[PDB]
Paper text:
Potyviral CP plays a role in virtually every step of the viral infection cycle, from transmission of the virion by aphids, virus assembly and disassembly, regulation of genome amplification, protein translation, to cell-to-cell and long-distance movement. CP consists of a highly conserved globular core flanked by two large extended regions with a high frequency of structural disorder. The C-terminal high intrinsic disorder region (C-IDR) is partially conserved and packaged in the lumen of the virion, supported by the helical ssRNA scaffold. Here, we show that we can control the shape, size, RNA encapsidation ability, symmetry, stability and surface functionalization of nanoparticles through structure-based design of CP from potato virus Y (PVY).
Unlike other CP double cysteine mutants, VLPT43C+D136C was unique in having more uniform distribution of filament length and instability at 60 °C. Cryo-EM revealed exclusively RNA-packing filaments with left-handed helical symmetry, and overall resolution of 2.4 Å, which to our knowledge is the highest resolution for the potyviral VLPs. The structure of CPT43C+D136C and the thermal stability profile of the respective filaments strongly resembled that of PVY virus. The cryo-EM density for VLPT43C+D136C was defined starting at residue V44, indicating the absence of the disulfide bond between C43 and C136 and thus the redundancy of one of the introduced cysteines. D136 is located in the β-hairpin of the CP core region. Together with E139 from the same β-hairpin and R46 from the N-IDR of the adjacent CP, it forms a triangle of conserved charged residues. Disruption of these interactions by mutations in the R46/D136/E139 triangle favors the VLPh+RNA type of assembly, in which the loss of interaction between the β-hairpin and the N-IDR is compensated for by the extensive interaction network between 13 CP subunits and CP-RNA interactions present in ‘h+RNA’ filaments. Therefore, it was not surprising that the CP-construct CPΔC60:T43C+D136C, which integrates both the inability to bind RNA and the weakened N-IDR binding, was not soluble. These results demonstrate that we can produce monomorphic RNA-encapsidating VLPs with a narrow length distribution by simple modifications of the CP-CP interface at the N-IDR-core contact. To obtain a quantitative overview of all RNA transcripts encapsidated in VLPs, we employed nanopore direct RNA sequencing. This showed that ~70% of the RNA packaged in VLPT43C+D136C belonged to CPT43C+D136C mRNA and 30% were assigned to the bacterial RNAs.
Residue numbers in the entry:
A (entry chain Bp): 44 to 54
B (entry chain Bk), C (entry chain Bn): 55 to 267
D (entry chain Bs): 162 to 214
E (entry chain Ag): 55 to 107
Write the structure that this text describes.
RNA sequence: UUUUU
RNA sequence: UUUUU
RNA sequence: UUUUU
RNA sequence: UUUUU
RNA sequence: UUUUU
């Protein structure tokens, strides 16, 4: 499963 | 006798005789379908995961919530076991988008959670950590030993008693407070008084009534 | 019934049927593998010990923690028994790098600790000092009498009861405080007023309104 | 305007080491899981947890 | 199961199986041997008494 | 851990 | 931030 | 979850 | 609203 | 209804 970035562009 | 207003029954007898909703669909202990869709969409958006890999993450989250509960105060990350590796997912999107509560959202997973616990117990001793904290001494009741389990008309009477006792033991005598500390901090009044070089002191303009002797 | 959003089940049935993680791997009462690796690397770095002699130090630390607990307030040094000699290791790297807590980090050592206690009891009476403080009167329960023991689905019911009673006795009615004394010390306002040789006193510029009679 | 990024950065730094902002050290905040809100320009929103608020 | 970091057990099984310290030697309710020696030497020095008396 | 005179 | 002798 | 020295 | 160094 | 980590 993919890993979630800490600080993404969605925020 | 039917309820009547202004000489007319206020109920539709035919529709009512044909009205057979599922009990879990009209209970207020479970989040509505609209609220569940909102939560699911918000979690998809926050995780940046496509609609095909999302159910796997949902499976992992359901198992993690079986183990560790669905309290509003849970924070940090939850974990999925990808083979022998551990993948960490932030819990903030899961909790901040669950309305009215995370327990009501996860109540939609209750039947699947019970089935999963039974399946895991078919191959090894599998009591959810919630049931270990509650000190439940019966292994055949492991399928109901999670905090988001939804009691239905098909729940066995013994299981219902065990679940209610576990809920009472877990909640204890916790009393809800409607308010925290008020965010208005300033209690004094702003000092609007001038200050000139003619003032005898920073706090007194003059000493008018003062007599030297 | 499965949880559905927008006319589509939100769970992957095949993966879920094949999803069988270990219970201790997904519990939040144990530090994650990443946190454990971070703690282990930080302790290696602080001790300046190679990767070959590090497991021996880990053995010594595990035995010491079985004896003396894993409280956040432990300080000073811990000791290893190199034959008849005593080697002292600082406890600061062990405690300051353990996240979220030292107990969660040492929970990874729980099965080995239980096995070690059983092995030591095979040759002599060996009750961990934690179980002596708790006044546990059963010697056959010595294998669970340490404060970082992790309760699992394989823990015997009697052992689970004893461990929960020991935890309740040790914690008593301790209440957590979120804050200490605030570090902002100054409460007064800075005195910005000038002071010239024309001032009648160090605190008064003049005596303007004063009348002698 | 930087509050969400600051919170995310504090969480990211805490993923690798103990990272409490000096503001939270001056305030003597004894909870490390609340480090992500322990700065003086943090903006409280409707998504802020009640305990964090 | 043993505690593992980066795909490697962090414990030495052979040494641990051979590690049998005395319980009173590793407890923190008793002063360490170094502290005891320091106290004994300080008391000898203060009392001006030989190692035989 | 300490605090047992 | 400073002010801890 | 924490708080068990 | 401000005043959180 | 909530409050079960």
């Amino acid at each position: 499963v993919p890993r979630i970035k800490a600080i993404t562009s969605k925020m | 006798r039917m309820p009547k207003s202004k000489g007319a029954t206020v109920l539709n007898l035919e529709h009512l005789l044909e009205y057979a909703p599922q009990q879990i669909d009209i209970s207020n202990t479970r989040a509505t379908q609209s609220q569940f869709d909102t939560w699911y969409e918000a979690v998809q958006l926050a995780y940046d995961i496509g609609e095909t890999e999302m159910p796997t993450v949902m499976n992992g989250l359901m198992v993690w919530c079986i183990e560790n509960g669905t309290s509003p105060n849970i924070n940090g990350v939850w974990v999925m076991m990808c083979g022998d590796e551990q993948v960490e997912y932030p819990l903030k999107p899961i909790v901040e988008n669950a309305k009215p509560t995370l327990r009501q959202i996860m109540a939609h997973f209750s039947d699947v959670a019970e089935a999963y616990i039974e399946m895991r117990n078919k191959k090894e001793p599998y009591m959810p950590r919630y049931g270990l904290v509650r000190n439940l001494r019966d292994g055949s009741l492991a399928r109901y030993a999670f905090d988001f389990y939804e009691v239905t008309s098909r729940t066995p009477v013994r299981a219902r008693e065990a679940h209610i006792q576990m809920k009472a033991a877990a909640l204890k005598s916790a009393q809800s407070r409607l308010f925290g500390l008020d965010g208005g901090i300033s209690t004094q009044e702003e000092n609007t008084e001038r200050h000139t070089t003619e003032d005898v002191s920073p706090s007194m303009h003059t000493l008018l009534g003062v007599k030297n002797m």
